[PDB]
Structure formats: C-alpha cells, structure tokens
Amino acid sequence: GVPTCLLPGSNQFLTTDDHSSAPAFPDFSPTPEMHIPGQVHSMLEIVQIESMMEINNVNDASGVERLRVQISAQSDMDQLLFNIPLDIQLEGPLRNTLLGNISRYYTHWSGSLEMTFMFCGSFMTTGKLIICYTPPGGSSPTDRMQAMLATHVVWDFGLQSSITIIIPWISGSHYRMFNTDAKAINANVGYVTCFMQTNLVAPVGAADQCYIVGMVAAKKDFNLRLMRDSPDIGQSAILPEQA
Amino acid sequence: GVPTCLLPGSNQFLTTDDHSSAPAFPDFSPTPEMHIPGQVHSMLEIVQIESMMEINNVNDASGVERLRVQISAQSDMDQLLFNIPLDIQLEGPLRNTLLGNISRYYTHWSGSLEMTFMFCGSFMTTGKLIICYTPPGGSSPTDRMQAMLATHVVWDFGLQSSITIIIPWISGSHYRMFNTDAKAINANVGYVTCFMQTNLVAPVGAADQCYIVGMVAAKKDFNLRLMRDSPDIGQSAILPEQA
Amino acid sequence: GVPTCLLPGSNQFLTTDDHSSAPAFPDFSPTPEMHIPGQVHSMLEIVQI
Amino acid sequence: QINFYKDSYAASASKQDFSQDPSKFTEPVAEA
Amino acid sequence: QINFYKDSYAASASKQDFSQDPSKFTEPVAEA
Amino acid sequence: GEIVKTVANTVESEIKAELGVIPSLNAVETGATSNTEPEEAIQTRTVINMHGTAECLVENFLGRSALVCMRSFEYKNHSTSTSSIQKNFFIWTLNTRELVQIRRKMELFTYLRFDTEITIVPTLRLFSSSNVSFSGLPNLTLQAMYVPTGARKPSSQDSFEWQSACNPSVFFKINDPPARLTIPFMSINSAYANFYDGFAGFEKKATVLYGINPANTMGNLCLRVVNSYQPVQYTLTVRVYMKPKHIKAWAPRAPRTMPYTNILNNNYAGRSAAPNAPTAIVSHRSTIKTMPNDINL
Amino acid sequence: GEIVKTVANTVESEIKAELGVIPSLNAVETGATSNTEPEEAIQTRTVINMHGTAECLVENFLGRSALVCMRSFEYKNHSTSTSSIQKNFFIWTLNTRELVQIRRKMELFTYLRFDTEITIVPTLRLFSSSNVSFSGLPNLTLQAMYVPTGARKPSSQDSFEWQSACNPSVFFKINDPPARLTIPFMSINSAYANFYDGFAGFEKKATVLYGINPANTMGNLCLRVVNSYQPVQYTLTVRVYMKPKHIKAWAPRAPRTMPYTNILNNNYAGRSAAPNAPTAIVSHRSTIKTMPNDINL
Amino acid sequence: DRVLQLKLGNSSIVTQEAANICCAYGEWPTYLPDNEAVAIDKPTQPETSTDRFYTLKSKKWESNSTGWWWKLPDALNQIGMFGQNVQYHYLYRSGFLCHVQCNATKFHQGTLLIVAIPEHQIGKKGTGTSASFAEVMKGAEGGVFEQPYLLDDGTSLACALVYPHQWINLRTNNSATIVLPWMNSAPMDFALRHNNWTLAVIPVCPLAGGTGNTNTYVPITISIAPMCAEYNGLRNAI
Amino acid sequence: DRVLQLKLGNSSIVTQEAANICCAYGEWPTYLPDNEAVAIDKPTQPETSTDRFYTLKSKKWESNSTGWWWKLPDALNQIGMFGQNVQYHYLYRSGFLCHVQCNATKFHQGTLLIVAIPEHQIGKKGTGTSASFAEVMKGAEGGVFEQPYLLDDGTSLACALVYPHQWINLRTNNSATIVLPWMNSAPMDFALRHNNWTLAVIPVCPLAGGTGNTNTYVPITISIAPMCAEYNGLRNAI
C-alpha cells in the first residue's frame, strides 16, 4: 500500500477545521436559490449601520429614556452636558450597538468610528454644541477650554438635524483590545465629551427641555480580527421545551 | 511515508456512503446482460402510472368494494357524492397507491397530480359530475355553489369513459411535507370533492346504481426529495424460516 | 498532513485481496527462469483432457 | 465513479443514469 | 475549496466571497 | 427515452373553447395512463422548474446500505462432559427477506441485477453471569467465510473447513472499523428474481416448495470467533448490512401491503383491523363524504 | 458591490473653509447612515492600510463548529419485572436553539441557507454504583439514525426501526474519531428562517403555536448503543456539534439582549438588574457626566 | 381504433368493440437472438402449429365473482402442438398474445381488470405453508382468486396497474388484448415447473342489470396465442 | 428633496416635509419571475384595485406612548379588493409602500422611529407561553408595544436601525415613506397565517410643547399600498 505516517493532530476534532465530509443524503437536490433582499456577505456591512447608544445609562432612566440625552437651556456657560465611555468591551453606551454586539464576538479591532447626534427639539430651539474626542492619556475633560484642544466639531442646530464627529483611529498599534482592563494602553480609545458652545435657546411657546439621540457606527477602515464567544449571552442549562 | 491526519468521521460506517470496496471474488465473470422488458431507471416512472384510490374507505366496505364509489340517481340536486383526503402521508385513499407507497419512502414532494375517474355504469346511464379541487385554507366544501369557485372539471358521461382532473401544484413553498400533522401549511394539499352537475339518469332496463373508479398518478413535474423508511411495513422480530 | 478518512473494511484481512506487500528479502535475485515442459496457464486446459 | 481495484464490479455507485421512458408503462399501446 | 465526494454540498467552506454592498443598509434611499 | 435531470417545466396557456379537442377526457380501458397536461386542463403560467430527479433514481432508492441479517451467539466454552464441539460460530443462508424494509423495497421490482456491498458490524457484551466483574471487552478476531453451495460447512469453531483456501474469508477485529467487501452479481441468470412462480425441482412431491428460485441458491456466510474461548462469557452479535450497487431493475411491482410472516414464501395473515387488514388496507372514515382532518375555524 | 479584502485606505486632506459644503452635517431622518469621511471631518494623512476583512465574512463568522445538543442516557439493563423495553437510546429533535451562543449568532440574520456539518462526540463513564470496580471503558458501537419527519421512530434499543434501510444512519465507536457527516440544505423553502411571524397551521385554536415555522419541521436524530446491555452501568453523553457551510445570510437583525428561556419562542424574563435587564440593557453609571474608568494621575 | 382483427396462423379473431392492443412494457415478442442464446442445440420454430389462438374454457361472470387467473405456459401445456412441443422438449421460450372476451347488453354494467402479472407468486392467507403444486398448476382450467383485493398475495389490486393491463368496461369495451413478451431472467425455462405470466381477470365493478336484465348469463372467454415460440432439448415426452 | 408625491392607482399622497423614500434593502417590489415561480396555476394581477393606498385608523400620540405596530398583510386583509383577493385565494405575494403621517407645529418637539421589521416574532415578557393568535393578529387596528425598548422581543430598539427605517423628527419631517419588497424564503405565503413585515412606529423622544402648546392632539396615521400584488389558488372565501 501507500506508505503513511500519522502526524500529531490526526484523529482530533478541531471546531475550526475546514474539510469535506461524507454526504448523508446522496444526490440530494436542495431547494433552488431565490432572490431574497438584504443579503449579507460580511459583518463589516452591519457595524457600518448607525445604532443608538445608551448615553443616559443611569439608574433613574428606564427603557427608551436611556437612548436620549436630555438638554436644557443653561444659566451658566461652557458647561459639560454629557460624556460617552468608548469602552466597547465593558458595560457602556456603545455595548448595546451593532458595532458593540458584533465586535464583541471579536477580540481585536481597528479603524475609525463615527458618532452621529440628532437633535430632537423644536424648530424654534436653536443652539450650538461642541463635541470633542480626547485621545487617551489622562483624565476625561470637564472644561471646554481643554476639550477643544482635542478633536472636536462644533454643531449648530438647523434644517440639518444631525452632526457626525469622526473618532479617528489614533493608536500606536495596528489594533486595539477588547480587554477586561479599561485603562490598558492596548484597549482604551479615549473620551467623547459634549459641551455647550453658546447655549440652548427656545422661545416661550416651545419646550425648554430637549433630547439628543446619539448613534455610533464603523467606517470603511474598520477591522475586527480575533473571534471569541460573546460575553453578552449566557447559559446555565440546556434550554428546555418549556420554561 | 506520506504525512496524514485522520479527520473526524474516519473509521465510521455511514449507510449512505459511496466508495469502492474490496472484491471478494477476484476476476469474477458475471452472467451476461440480457434484455428484459420493463427496465426502470427512476421511481418517477412508477408514480406516473395510474392506480386506484380507496375512496370508499368505510367500515361497511370490504375488499374491492373500497375501490369503487357508488353513484345513484338523486331525488335532490347539487348534492355532494364523495370526497378524497389528499393526505398521502396519513391513512387515506391515496395511501394504497403507487404514488402513495413510493412517495412514502420520501419526506418532501412537489408537483401536479392527476385524478382519473372512470364511469362503470351502463351505456344507457348518462350524467354530469363536477369534480372540484379546493386549495387549503378552510373547510372542505359541502355545497356545489362554493366548490365550483375552485379548480374543477365538469364530467359528462359518454363514449369516453373517463375524466382527468389535474390537481395543480399550488403551494407557497417549493416542496410540501409528508408530515404527521395533516393541518400544517407545509403538508396539506387541499380537498377533492365531487358533486352532481345535473343527475344520474338510467332507463328502467338499466341499473339505477352505478360505480365510479378513481385512480391517481403523478405528472412529469412531480418530484420527491428526502428519503425515509416507509411507515407502511413493520417488523418486531427477525422473520423466521417457519411462521 | 494529507486529510484522510478510514473506510469500513480498512484494517481487515480478506483472503482474496490483491495488493503489493513488503519484500522481506530486499534486492533478492530469484533463480533464472527456465523452460520446463507442460506449462499450464488455465485450469480449462486440464478439464479438456 | 471511482475504483481502486482491478474488478469493475468493485467500483462505487453509478448514479449518472437520468434516462426515463414512462411510456413503457403509461402508453404501452400499439396505436398512438 | 476541496471535495472528495460526488455531492457539491459535501464540499469544504467557500470563504472567497469578499463582496460588500453596505449601501443596501446605509443608503437605502431612492434619491441620492 | 429522454434525459430527465429536472422535472418538466410548465408552459403558459390561454382560454380555449375548441371543438373536437377533449384533453381531459380519455379511455382508461386501453391500459394507458392519462396524458392530460396541466396546461390544457387549467390556465397555467410559465414555470421554469429546476427541481432535480437524482434522488428517485433506482441506484439511489435501492443503493443504500440496509440490514439484511442479525445473528448472535454465545462466545464461551461449549464443551461438556460428553462433547468437545465448540460452537462460537453461526451460519447464515444469504437472503434479503429476513428484514422487511429492504425486502419490500426490492420486491417493488420483479428482477434486479446488482453487485452488492456487505458491511459486517460486530458488537460484544459481557453476559450477566451469577458473579462476573465487567472486566472489559476483548478485541477478538472474527472470521467471516463465504461458503458457496455444495462446499462443506464448518460444524465447529475448531473445524478445518475454516482454512478458506478457496472460500473467500475476511478476518476482522471488534475494535477495527467494520468489515466490508463487494460481492458481485452471481445469479446463474441475468438477474435476481424476487418472485418465482414455479418450483425449483423436477419432481412433483410436496417437498418441492413453491416460490423457491433455483438461481437464488445463493450460498452461505459462516462467521466464527477465531480466538478460542475465554474463561468467561460474551454475547457476540453480528449485524450484516447490504448495499446494492450498479442496480438494474425491471418490471415494477404492486407494493406489499400485508406483513411478511416468513422468508420461504409471501403468505400473509394480515392485521386484525385496518390499516393493512386483508379486507381493509387503508384505515376507515365514517362516510365517503367525511373529512377526518377537516379544517375547522 | 465592490470587492473588499482590505479595509479602506485613508487619503490626505488639507484645510477647508468652503461655503455650501457641510459634510459633517446630515439627515438621519432619511434612514441613511452618515456618509461623512474622516478625510473631510479632520485633516488626515495618507495611510495605506493592508488589514484584511476575511475574518468578518459570514462564512467565517458562522462557519464554526458549535454545540447544538448534548444528551445523556444510562446504558444499562432497563428491563424490569414488568417491561422488557431497552432504553439505551435518545431521540433529539433537531434545532439550533438549545444552546445560546450558536442560537444568537444565527438569529443575527432573518434567513440563512447553509449546508451543515454535524460532528458527534460520544463520551462514556462508569456510574458510581454501590459497589463497582472501575473496570475500564468499553469500545461500544453507537448508531446515530436520522429519522425524517413522518417516518416511524424507534421506541426501544432493540426496535427494528434501526435497520436504517432508507434512513441515513452512521455507526461509530467510542474510541474512534468522532463521527462526522454533512447534512445539505433541506428547507422546503429557499432558506431557513430563524424567526417566523405566523402560525404553522391552518386552524385558529390555541394548540397552533406562534413562531413555529412549518419549513423548520427538520426531523430527528435517534442515537443508540448498538451493543446490548453490559452487566454494569455506564452514562453515555453525546455532544453534537454543528458547522454551517456555504452560508448565505439575509436581513441582519437586532441582536438578542435578553436571555433565552426556551426553544419554542423568543420570550424573555430578563435580569433582575442591569446589565441585560428589561428596563436596563447596559449597566449603570452615576451620571451622564461620570467616567466609570476615568484615568487618574 | 376500436375495430381490430388478429390473424395468427389458422386463427383469426375479430372484435368491433376493442380498446386497443396493450404491448406489455412496449415490447413485441421476438425470437431469441444469437448473442443472447445459451443452448447450443438447434431450436425448432414451428411458426404456425404453435403460434395460433388457443381458446380456453369460458368462465361464468356472477354478480359475486372474485376473479380468475390463468398461468402461462401452464394453461397451454396440453393444448395442441404447443403442448406437444413442450412435452417433447426440455426447454421453452415464447411470448403470448392474450385476448379476453366478455359481451353484455348496453343495459348491463360491469368492469373487468385484465392484468398480466410477471412472476405472480401466489401467497396464501392464514397459513405459513407454501402453495401446493395442485393449487398453483391448474392448466387450461385456471384458478380463482380467493383475495382479488390483494391479488392472492400481500400486494394490492389498486396498485395492480403497474402490470400490463386492460379493462373491459361494458360501456366501452367487450374485448381486451395484451401482448406479452418473453419475461424472464433466463433465455429459456422449463415450462412444466415455472410460469412467467399470470393472466388475471378481476371484476372491480360487479356485473349488474336493471329490471329484467338481472342474472344474465355472461361468460368470460380467454384466447391465448403463443408468439415466436421455440423449443429445445428434444427428448421423450414428459 | 423634501416635497414628494406618491401616485398609486386611484390614490395620490403629497407631502411637503419628507425626508426621502426608504427602499428596504435597496429593492423595489417586482412581480414574481417565471424562473422563481412554484405555483403553476395562472396568477391574477389586479394592478389598480389592490395596488393603491389604504389609509388605516389614526393613533393618538401621547406624551407617554410606547409605540404601535401594524403587521402586514394582516393589516390589509379585510380592506378593499386586496382583502377580497386574499380571502378568495390560497396564495399571496406583494410588496408594500408604507407612508406614516404625523404633523405638529414648529413649537412642538418629538421623534418617531418608523421601522419595518421582517419576520418580527413577538416575544412576550414574564411567561413561557407563546403569543396567542388574538394578541398577534389585530388587523387594521394594529398593536401597541409593551416593551418598545426591546421591540416586544429580546432584542433592542437601539439596534433596530438594521431594519429599513425612517424617522419623523418634527423639526425636519412630518412623513416617512418605506418601500417594502417581498421578504420571504418562499415565493408566496398564506396571508392569513403569516406576516412578513411589521411596521413599527415608536416614539424615541416624547411629544412635548411649551406653555400653551402642551397636550396638543397629534394623531399618527398609517397609509399602506400593496405593490405588485398577485394571488393564487383561487377558491371560496375564507
């Protein structure tokens, strides 16, 4: 016969193997292919889609109250309104997102993100905001006089309801980590802060209180590398037929 | 030697495998091929052959009485004469057929059927019947005023003894199921009903009572897909040499 | 390595098999062929007698 | 098919025979 | 890919499909 | 004979009220099956159907490995104070009739020609003796010997008929993958006959049985445990699986409805009641106007 | 659709103060995702990026072998003073919903078409009886038989439904490498549906359940110990691993956040508190101005 | 068409109410080809003393008749030079043309299924013992179906339409014709111990009539013609 | 642009504050191709008696409203010749154009997410029993979200933007239009037992106004047009 030696890793089962296997139903004719809308070829197509962040992830907020940040006319100036921890891996606003959910099936990532903030006030409510992305290295800014030193976009309300700030890929390494440690140089992305630029101004007939909805998505330079079981879903027993 | 790794599913016995195997009788010369009539290449050749349905599958009918539906002159009009459950999988008229027996070795099916009904009365017995196929969704019709709204053929007796109604393939899915549940959307085919169109009329010298023989077959669009052990034949012990 | 699956009837001994097998005496030179009368190639030659 | 033995009958299945003539059974009549 | 069996569905993975059209989901608007 | 890989396509049809053209009518008395088209009985649309037919081919319908035999014997010392014969072997006369699924599939055809593939699957167990530790399952060497008709049979484990100098024999172990080999088409005729309307002998007596086919004198499989008896018991069960190859089938059949009662004939006792009773094959419904599974809303 | 093996390169951009050009502004109400480029929102440099995208392809994201079932049964003599039935077998109705990782990955898409690869991994142990020496693990022969819907099931180890003349069955041993085979795409439809907004029956009653897909009547896997019972006990655990192949996915989904409570529906009870509570999916922070992981120096 | 004439040797059958000619499996009896032959001895091909219509005894069609079967060549093994070529020869090969006759008035109703079954092995009800030689070999007399609904077998009459078949529906038809080729796994056979075609006549719908036409004497007649008959192994008569 | 007119059959909808037209997954409803068809019977394509705007009942937008969903084709299964082609036919196929209307003053604020979810299987909270027929099939009346934050499912509203969606932000928009193709694994479906698109209207930001503009009566109106509708399996009405 043909001489043969059986190498290590011969008889085993590697869940990531890729081989042909015996067909149980020989000559089976599967149902003809049919055009169905929305065919997905890559998961990078999905993370490119906007999805809301739970910026108001606070105890007092329940349900849809968590998807909208609440903005009011200020009696002060230069005031911080809200922040966003860019920790995808940890329990933060970006977790419950397409970017967050899908990326969390992976361990490494790279690429620019976009945050889009849509103003949900009155046509009569005007205002200017400054949204700043601060690369890592220090505290999260609390003063607009420092946040503006970083990447920022001033957002004037108007007929265009939304503003996009790009969170540029600013990393020493080609990739970052979905690590349990937020403060590791390989994992942290920085901070996104929002300050008042002038104020929120609404006339008497309009509400003084307004909502901003934040959505995040990946850009076309986004990459996800090392696959893993998602920590979001868990199990302690085989799911039964009745609860 | 040649490096080799032994994949999962190596040493096993899959009853549907397809490989060459050692010849026990080397250089054996089998008996020469000889022309025998009726060579079969596909089982779709067989289900295309007509075969009687046990339409009169009732307790009071024994044997050949079950293969013939009994038709009489009516004193009423528009009356239902008989129905046919199209449930191949379940115990119905179509089970004990070539279509039924052979298809029951399979789990999925598709294609049009034909029912042929042959009048076995007198040359003097005239009449018109309306045979209706009702797609699924509701009750089986009991009134000709509804059955005619579905697929139907009016059948006038004459020198041509038989009528064919095509049960068209009307399904959302490419295939249906030989499922234990008759009322599942994947399994049910509808209903076939027969009503009087005018009446059965026979002169005094001829019998007032007449027989119709129903036969069913598949058409050339018929397909059977997933193979299975037939539920029709069973066994509790190895068949002995003496009963 | 080369992927491989071991089919049924792999490790067995079928007395009618027909394969090459390891030579125990490598490079052995068998005695030269010599013409001997009455060479038989088939058993149908014998039943004809 | 595929075969690793001399004998033709040792070969694998021959499943490439898609011919059909139901007329042998559905129209076995001399005159059409 | 690679296959040692007749049936096409027995074959190994088909991982050479690098097409992307996110516009189906990111710009699903009639007018650009 | 046309080639049919995919089922027929459907052609578009329009209204039709022509005289002299009656496609839905036909004459069953000719022995012919209705040639009525869906297109001329109803109004149809154009359907390009790509559904395959490969899986109704007789090569696939029959070309599946099926159990044809299952024999067990006790692997022990059968020698007593009188006889020395060892009996850790069984002899099986080959047939496709001991198990009904394979039997009925291939009684769907009058004549079959097929080279057949046999796979032997042995399984051991330890017999529950009065006091025996389950000390594991030995890797015994089994010998399956094909004994063609007219050859002398082994009547013992130690018999010298087991040389298998001429008889084909396969040696395999418990732990090894199941034994396999291909038996050719061996009928003295051009095909196996699943049914034989006649007698296999030239004599008229009662001992010449009806339905026995002389060409189906198919020989025997003798299987032995080559290892001699252990101190303790084992029950060896051998399942033989048989797979027709290169099938060629003739003259389809009326499918069996009654249960099989034996392998020597096709006699039947039937069910007590429907389904599959002699007087009632299909189960009952109250009336011909009754829907057992009527959809109620 | 353009080909994307490597992620987008970045182009160099300069200062810009043009009127009528507002790239960072956009209209979310259109349903469209922001098309703002990094190049026109900030000043960028030229970056030639060679990072691959192969490992986010759905073939790789889904094409990993995942546990879908884990059944165990006691391999022993189940015969009592009353019943002879042997029960060293289990029957599993096939589904991708008993284990959450595989379930949720593939509820990320509404419709999937994939030929699936099944690997069966059996493991034995010796049951800790009142008094039993650990006399080793036998090399039992197992039989996994696919029973398509409508076919009769085995209700015993010794049943004759196990012929598997038609049903595909695979025989494998404990010590051999795990059994493997490829099941094709079998839906009567063009794709499997992970979600079905409807009812699988024509009737209205309560017994017709919401979310049950008729096309997902996917049949059953019956697994048996072919070896008959040993004198002593063994607990056979079978893990079935399933690997989609040639996947084709449609209509991505909102990912599951609540735990699964069952396989017949997508109902949820939720966490007591965040994370993954019905009122709070993401865990809390004190205020929208609070950094839980603020860097302190 | 319906009017048909069958001229074989001396014989000539006319029928003015025929359905058609059923050629079993589309074949037409032929003589054994040289490349299919086995027996080397030269065959005898009488061609007119055997290949002719042999009309068997008629059966009375009752309102309760189960059905009749005739086994071939058994039915003809004593009739004419056909039987005397069978008796004097070990080996036999032929095809058969079977013509069944049944007339009734236009006021009568009924339906006969005329089936030619290959290798119709008769299974018997309520016993494990195989059918005896006498219960199977009845010759020109033929046999009667105990269980037409199962074809005196574990099979069904409903699925009997796989076999070469014709009906005699008295509305449409009074005669049925089936052409039977040589149907065997061997190029020949010993005609005295094996039958290859069973011609079965089974009433599916009973013979009935109206007032005054009840209980009419309606016979059923079988005419069988050997076709391309050849015999081999000439020896003494058996 | 923002000004839009939709002319379908009899109907014609104008809106002067529109965002755009959302074509779900970039598709545009088409009739079933011949090579994708399954049912051989000829389909009926009314093209004007069905393919037209059907305006459903209006919902009142409260400051505490959770959201509303309408299931298709269920919502239209009794409205017009569309419903009467569904009732009289076993099989159904169509696309839908959904137009949602909500006006408010420039002094009002609010935001509606208009989502068209395919195969939106409703999971229910605090029970293992599946949703009943009544709680799922509400027709033109539609349903109300118990849990908009989870989409009456174990999923999330944040990630609902995968689905074909538009917003009605009263600053920018008063109407949203989504074009829904045929979204199924089968070329047809039984319209009375399966819904393929769920149109969900969910307030993400509550309706609010300032002094004097509080508690304004702001309705939400749904207009749905079947698109390229075709029916098959003509039978009696169900």
Numbering used by the authors:
A (entry chain C), B (entry chain C): 1 to 243
C (entry chain C): 1 to 49
D (entry chain D), E (entry chain D): 28 to 59
F (entry chain A), G (entry chain A): 7 to 303
H (entry chain B), I (entry chain B): 11 to 248
Paper text:
Enterovirus 70 (EV70) is a human pathogen belonging to the family Picornaviridae. EV70 is transmitted by eye secretions and causes acute hemorrhagic conjunctivitis, a serious eye disease. The capsid of EV70 is composed of the subunits VP1, VP2, VP3, and VP4. The major capsid proteins of EV70 are organized with pseudo-T=3 icosahedral symmetry, with VP1 subunits forming pentamers around 5-fold symmetry axes and VP2 and VP3 subunits forming heterohexamers at 3-fold axes of the capsid.
